[PDB]
Design an enzyme around this catalytic site. Structure first.
Site, mmCIF file in Angstrom:
data_model
loop_
_atom_site.group_PDB
_atom_site.id
_atom_site.type_symbol
_atom_site.label_atom_id
_atom_site.label_comp_id
_atom_site.label_asym_id
_atom_site.label_seq_id
_atom_site.Cartn_x
_atom_site.Cartn_y
_atom_site.Cartn_z
ATOM 1 C CE1 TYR A 27 -2.894 -3.281 1.197
ATOM 2 C CE2 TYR A 27 -4.236 -1.624 0.091
ATOM 3 C CZ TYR A 27 -4.047 -2.925 0.517
ATOM 4 O OH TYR A 27 -5.008 -3.866 0.232
ATOM 5 N N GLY A 29 2.558 3.795 -1.736
ATOM 6 C CA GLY A 29 2.926 4.235 -3.069
ATOM 7 C C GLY A 29 1.920 3.961 -4.170
ATOM 8 N N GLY A 31 -0.743 1.565 -3.764
ATOM 9 C CA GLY A 31 -2.030 1.342 -3.119
ATOM 10 C C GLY A 31 -2.564 -0.027 -3.471
ATOM 11 C CG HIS A 47 -2.058 8.125 4.059
ATOM 12 N ND1 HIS A 47 -1.681 8.372 2.757
ATOM 13 C CD2 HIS A 47 -2.100 9.331 4.676
ATOM 14 C CE1 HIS A 47 -1.498 9.674 2.593
ATOM 15 N NE2 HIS A 47 -1.746 10.277 3.740
ATOM 16 C CG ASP A 48 -3.858 3.882 0.095
ATOM 17 O OD1 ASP A 48 -3.214 4.944 -0.042
ATOM 18 O OD2 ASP A 48 -3.523 2.798 -0.429
ATOM 19 C CE1 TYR A 51 -4.450 11.870 2.032
ATOM 20 C CE2 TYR A 51 -3.547 10.965 -0.006
ATOM 21 C CZ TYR A 51 -3.436 11.809 1.085
ATOM 22 O OH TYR A 51 -2.310 12.593 1.217
ATOM 23 C CE1 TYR A 64 -0.472 19.323 5.386
ATOM 24 C CE2 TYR A 64 -1.637 18.232 3.590
ATOM 25 C CZ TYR A 64 -0.652 18.225 4.566
ATOM 26 O OH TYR A 64 0.167 17.127 4.694
ATOM 27 C CG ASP A 89 -1.201 14.028 4.195
ATOM 28 O OD1 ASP A 89 -1.816 13.018 3.783
ATOM 29 O OD2 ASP A 89 -0.867 14.970 3.445
HETATM 30 C C1 LIG Z 1 8.793 13.674 -7.763
HETATM 31 C C2 LIG Z 1 8.674 12.263 -8.346
HETATM 32 C C3 LIG Z 1 9.555 12.120 -9.594
HETATM 33 N N1 LIG Z 1 7.277 12.012 -8.669
HETATM 34 C C4 LIG Z 1 6.550 10.901 -8.059
HETATM 35 C C5 LIG Z 1 5.364 11.459 -7.261
HETATM 36 O O1 LIG Z 1 4.117 11.127 -7.909
HETATM 37 C C6 LIG Z 1 5.404 10.920 -5.824
HETATM 38 O O2 LIG Z 1 5.025 9.519 -5.734
HETATM 39 C C7 LIG Z 1 4.045 9.110 -4.848
HETATM 40 C C8 LIG Z 1 2.655 9.397 -5.065
HETATM 41 C C9 LIG Z 1 1.683 8.952 -4.110
HETATM 42 C C10 LIG Z 1 2.064 8.223 -2.937
HETATM 43 C C11 LIG Z 1 1.022 7.749 -1.899
HETATM 44 C C12 LIG Z 1 0.728 8.697 -0.723
HETATM 45 N N2 LIG Z 1 1.846 9.245 -0.213
HETATM 46 O O3 LIG Z 1 -0.440 8.920 -0.298
HETATM 47 C C13 LIG Z 1 3.451 7.951 -2.752
HETATM 48 C C14 LIG Z 1 4.427 8.391 -3.697
#
Ligand SMILES: CC(C)NC[C@@H](O)COc1ccc(CC(N)=O)cc1
Length: 121
Positions: A27, A29, A31, A47-48, A51, A64, A89
Protein backbone atom coordinates in the site's frame (compact mmCIF):
# COMPACT_ATOMS: atom_id res chain seq x y z
CA UNK A 1 -0.42 17.82 -1.17
CA UNK A 2 2.49 15.43 -1.77
CA UNK A 3 4.83 18.34 -1.02
CA UNK A 4 3.53 18.79 2.54
CA UNK A 5 3.18 15.04 3.11
CA UNK A 6 6.77 14.44 2.02
CA UNK A 7 8.11 17.16 4.32
CA UNK A 8 6.07 15.73 7.20
CA UNK A 9 7.51 12.24 6.64
CA UNK A 10 11.11 13.47 6.46
CA UNK A 11 10.70 15.56 9.62
CA UNK A 12 9.12 12.63 11.50
CA UNK A 13 11.32 9.73 10.40
CA UNK A 14 14.48 11.18 8.90
CA UNK A 15 13.65 9.13 5.76
CA UNK A 16 12.82 10.63 2.38
CA UNK A 17 9.31 9.73 1.17
CA UNK A 18 10.81 8.70 -2.16
CA UNK A 19 12.16 5.97 -2.25
CA UNK A 20 11.53 4.86 1.37
CA UNK A 21 7.72 5.07 1.43
CA UNK A 22 6.81 5.22 -2.27
CA UNK A 23 7.25 1.54 -3.20
CA UNK A 24 6.98 -0.18 0.16
CA UNK A 25 4.82 -3.25 0.70
CA UNK A 26 1.38 -3.43 -0.89
CA UNK A 27 0.00 0.00 0.00
CA UNK A 28 2.84 2.50 0.30
CA UNK A 29 2.93 4.23 -3.07
CA UNK A 30 0.77 2.28 -5.53
CA UNK A 31 -2.03 1.34 -3.12
CA UNK A 32 -3.77 -1.37 -5.07
CA UNK A 33 -4.39 -4.83 -3.64
CA UNK A 34 -3.87 -7.37 -0.85
CA UNK A 35 -3.08 -7.69 2.84
CA UNK A 36 -0.61 -5.20 4.42
CA UNK A 37 2.83 -6.78 4.87
CA UNK A 38 3.68 -5.17 8.21
CA UNK A 39 2.91 -2.24 10.54
CA UNK A 40 4.40 0.39 8.20
CA UNK A 41 2.35 -1.02 5.31
CA UNK A 42 -0.76 -0.87 7.52
CA UNK A 43 -0.05 2.82 8.07
CA UNK A 44 -0.26 3.31 4.30
CA UNK A 45 -3.41 1.16 4.07
CA UNK A 46 -5.15 3.34 6.66
CA UNK A 47 -3.81 6.46 4.90
CA UNK A 48 -5.36 5.24 1.63
CA UNK A 49 -8.63 4.64 3.46
CA UNK A 50 -8.46 8.09 5.03
CA UNK A 51 -8.11 9.64 1.56
CA UNK A 52 -10.92 7.33 0.47
CA UNK A 53 -13.26 9.15 2.86
CA UNK A 54 -12.72 12.36 0.82
CA UNK A 55 -14.07 11.59 -2.70
CA UNK A 56 -14.48 15.25 -3.67
CA UNK A 57 -11.07 16.45 -2.41
CA UNK A 58 -7.74 16.27 -4.25
CA UNK A 59 -5.17 15.17 -1.61
CA UNK A 60 -2.22 14.87 -4.01
CA UNK A 61 -2.39 18.48 -5.25
CA UNK A 62 -4.38 20.53 -2.73
CA UNK A 63 -1.90 22.31 -0.46
CA UNK A 64 -2.47 22.85 3.26
CA UNK A 65 -0.50 24.60 6.00
CA UNK A 66 0.74 22.96 9.19
CA UNK A 67 3.05 24.04 11.99
CA UNK A 68 4.98 22.49 14.86
CA UNK A 69 4.04 23.31 18.44
CA UNK A 70 7.01 21.85 20.28
CA UNK A 71 7.11 18.61 18.40
CA UNK A 72 3.39 18.13 17.76
CA UNK A 73 2.07 18.56 14.19
CA UNK A 74 -0.75 21.12 14.11
CA UNK A 75 -2.94 21.47 11.01
CA UNK A 76 -3.79 25.10 10.32
CA UNK A 77 -7.22 26.32 9.24
CA UNK A 78 -7.88 26.10 5.50
CA UNK A 79 -10.75 24.80 3.36
CA UNK A 80 -12.60 21.78 4.77
CA UNK A 81 -10.81 19.49 2.29
CA UNK A 82 -7.42 20.92 3.25
CA UNK A 83 -8.16 20.42 6.95
CA UNK A 84 -9.19 16.80 6.42
CA UNK A 85 -6.30 15.99 4.10
CA UNK A 86 -3.84 17.35 6.64
CA UNK A 87 -5.35 15.20 9.43
CA UNK A 88 -4.95 12.09 7.24
CA UNK A 89 -1.31 12.92 6.48
CA UNK A 90 -0.52 13.84 10.10
CA UNK A 91 -1.83 10.46 11.26
CA UNK A 92 0.26 8.62 8.66
CA UNK A 93 3.45 10.52 9.57
CA UNK A 94 3.01 9.67 13.25
CA UNK A 95 2.17 6.06 12.38
CA UNK A 96 5.42 5.80 10.36
CA UNK A 97 7.35 7.18 13.34
CA UNK A 98 5.66 4.73 15.70
CA UNK A 99 6.71 1.77 13.56
CA UNK A 100 10.19 2.82 12.44
CA UNK A 101 11.70 0.00 14.51
CA UNK A 102 10.10 -2.67 12.32
CA UNK A 103 10.65 -0.86 9.01
CA UNK A 104 12.15 -3.53 6.73
CA UNK A 105 14.20 -2.96 3.57
CA UNK A 106 12.97 -6.30 2.26
CA UNK A 107 9.60 -4.70 1.52
CA UNK A 108 11.06 -1.98 -0.70
CA UNK A 109 10.10 -2.40 -4.38
CA UNK A 110 7.79 -5.22 -3.28
CA UNK A 111 6.46 -7.16 -6.32
CA UNK A 112 2.79 -6.78 -7.22
CA UNK A 113 1.94 -10.48 -7.55
CA UNK A 114 2.77 -11.01 -3.88
CA UNK A 115 0.08 -8.55 -2.80
CA UNK A 116 -2.92 -10.83 -2.39
CA UNK A 117 -5.78 -10.84 0.06
CA UNK A 118 -9.00 -9.10 1.04
CA UNK A 119 -9.10 -6.04 3.31
CA UNK A 120 -11.91 -3.50 3.26
CA UNK A 121 -11.54 -0.09 4.90
C1 LIG B 1 8.79 13.67 -7.76
C2 LIG B 1 8.67 12.26 -8.35
C3 LIG B 1 9.56 12.12 -9.59
N1 LIG B 1 7.28 12.01 -8.67
C4 LIG B 1 6.55 10.90 -8.06
C5 LIG B 1 5.36 11.46 -7.26
O1 LIG B 1 4.12 11.13 -7.91
C6 LIG B 1 5.40 10.92 -5.82
O2 LIG B 1 5.02 9.52 -5.73
C7 LIG B 1 4.05 9.11 -4.85
C8 LIG B 1 2.66 9.40 -5.06
C9 LIG B 1 1.68 8.95 -4.11
C10 LIG B 1 2.06 8.22 -2.94
C11 LIG B 1 1.02 7.75 -1.90
C12 LIG B 1 0.73 8.70 -0.72
N2 LIG B 1 1.85 9.25 -0.21
O3 LIG B 1 -0.44 8.92 -0.30
C13 LIG B 1 3.45 7.95 -2.75
C14 LIG B 1 4.43 8.39 -3.70
Amino acid sequence: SLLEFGKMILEETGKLAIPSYSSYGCYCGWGGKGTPKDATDRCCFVHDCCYGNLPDCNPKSDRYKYKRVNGAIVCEKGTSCENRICECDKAAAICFRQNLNTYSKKYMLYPDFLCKGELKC
